Amino acid sequence: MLKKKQLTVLDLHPGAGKTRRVLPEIVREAIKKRLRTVILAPTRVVAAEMEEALRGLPVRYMTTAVNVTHSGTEIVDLMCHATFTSRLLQPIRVPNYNLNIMDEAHFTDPSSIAARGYISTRVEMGEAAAIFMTATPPGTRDAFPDSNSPIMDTEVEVPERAWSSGFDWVTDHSGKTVWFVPSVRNGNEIAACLTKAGKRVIQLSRKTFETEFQKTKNQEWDFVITTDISEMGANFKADRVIDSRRCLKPVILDGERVILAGPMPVTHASAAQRRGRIGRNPNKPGDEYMYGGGCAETDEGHAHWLEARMLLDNIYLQDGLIASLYRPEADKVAAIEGEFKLRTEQRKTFVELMKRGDLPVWLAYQVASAGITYTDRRWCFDGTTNNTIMEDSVPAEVWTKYGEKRVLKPRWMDARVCSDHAALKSFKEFAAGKR
Numbered sequence: 001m002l003k004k005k006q007l008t009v010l011d012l013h014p015g016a017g018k019t020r021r022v023l024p025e026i027v028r029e030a031i032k033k034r035l036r037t038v039i040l041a042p043t044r045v046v047a048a049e050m051e052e053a054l055r056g057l058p059v060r061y062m063t064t065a066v067n068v069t070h071s072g073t074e075i076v077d078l079m080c081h082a083t084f085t086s087r088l089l090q091p092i093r094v095p096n097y098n099l100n101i102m103d104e105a106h107f108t109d110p111s112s113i114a115a116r117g118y119i120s121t122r123v124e125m126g127e128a129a130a131i132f133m134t135a136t137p138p139g140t141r142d143a144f145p146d147s148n149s150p151i152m153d154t155e156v157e158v159p160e161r162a163w164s165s166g167f168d169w170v171t172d173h174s175g176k177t178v179w180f181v182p183s184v185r186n187g188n189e190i191a192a193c194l195t196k197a198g199k200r201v202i203q204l205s206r207k208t209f210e211t212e213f214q215k216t217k218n219q220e221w222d223f224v225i226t227t228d229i230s231e232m233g234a235n236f237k238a239d240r241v242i243d244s245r246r247c248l249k250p251v252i253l254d255g256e257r258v259i260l261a262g263p264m265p266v267t268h269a270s271a272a273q274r275r276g277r278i279g280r281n282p283n284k285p286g287d288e289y290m291y292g293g294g295c296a297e298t299d300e301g302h303a304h305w306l307e308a309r310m311l312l313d314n315i316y317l318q319d320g321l322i323a324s325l326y327r328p329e330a331d332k333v334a335a336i337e338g339e340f341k342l343r344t345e346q347r348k349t350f351v352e353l354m355k356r357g358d359l360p361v362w363l364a365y366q367v368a369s370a371g372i373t374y375t376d377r378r379w380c381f382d383g384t385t386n387n388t389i390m391e392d393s394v395p396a397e398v399w400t401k402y403g404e405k406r407v408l409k410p411r412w413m414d415a416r417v418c419s420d421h422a423a424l425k426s427f428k429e430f431a432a433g434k435r
């Protein structure tokens with residue numbers, strides 16, 4: 001696999017040992033052949049699990065998730081998918097790695113799609129080798145793959161709201177359950193219902209992932225209520241997965257706004273990864289997987305593929321050449337390579353709105369392409385009245401950096417900035433000029 005001009009997909013079934021058995025062996029061969037290598041982890045939690053599998057090998061951990069003393073003798077670098085894409089965007093010179101390893105290469109976040117595009121382009125050019133590690137490569141139609149031990153698969157109606165009757169099987173369980181919900185607000189309702197019934201619940205989501213995941217190892221729990229973030233390598237000591245088979249889909253309407261569409265069916269890749277959390281112990285057969293819907297190809301027209309094109313159009317590759325998306329996922333968006341290329345100063349603003357502003361890619365691009373500077377927040381209040389952000393069914397208000405109380409009404413409306421309480425509080429802070 002380590003021969004240049006070669007991209008290998010390592011598609012062993014979930015729990016076959018890609019991370020703990022195959023990855024250390026690849027690292028050893030790369031160090032023997034003096035290949036400057038990058039290892040890309042989807043989350044800080046997977047990076048910490050990788051340090052355990054790679055302990056004793058000279059790897060440089062470019063993450064704050066691991067507390068190791070780097071000697072300077074390392075030719076292998078380990079960083080998160082988002083860190084790699086960020087460093088490509090920023091004016092930091094990233095080495096041109098001879099070997100690129102992506103763990104959980106199925107991740108559909110824009111920074112992961114961009115990383116796959118950049119890497120696969122470098123391989124197509126004959127400049128580098130790559131390895132994509134995932135049980136569910138882009139374009140999988142099988143949601144029931146192999147596992148370490150047999151899983152009991154059951155199609156059943158799954159509640160997506162609080163309940164009093166009709167779902168006795170949910171609370172009649174004596175083990176540990178991982179429940180995938182389409183959104184944070186949906187998770188809150190189900191968690192409140194389980195807690196009222198005397199159950200110990202941990203909730204997980206993108207923003208609180210590292211902190212709450214530690215609670216899954218540190219204390220006894222009955223249920224874990226999570227969003228799709230737990231599809232990226234998160235390991236649990238569970239015996240059942242309850243799967244709504246639903247997700248939210250960010251959609252760009254008329255090229256003017258972003259809505260969160262659905263809940264709608266997940267892809268086969270997500271269903272296989274959610275099911276993949278159980279049946280991982282060969283000595284314990286009979287783990288259950290209860291699913292409450294079918295799969296569909298909801299990644300076509302999904303805003304993340306357009307956002308990944310916005311990122312690759314602003315990453316330098318070679319003169320005016322721009323990286324293409326990784327071929328099996330390239331038709332998920334109708335986009336021309338280069339259409340989102342920004343001039344030097346607008347590009348710098350685009351990077352800063354994402355890095356410091358913490359805004360979604362699409363929204364950061366609308367602001368930067370309009371020729372607005374990072375600290376100028378007048379666009380958060382001058383949008384049409386239909387763009388009024390609402391808090392508790394009344395218009396949201398913020399004190400501007402001028403000491404004037406104004407209704408939050410952005411020129412470009414992106415539902416992700418107000419999808420939950422934490423997202424709205426963070427966007428109010430940005431509109432206030434607090435970061």
Ligand SMILES: O=C1NC(=O)[C@]2(CCCNC2)N1
Binds near residue numbers: 370371378
């Ligand atoms: O909202 C805006 N702030 C600004 O400085 C501009 C002025 C006119 C066009 N360039 C950007 N717009």
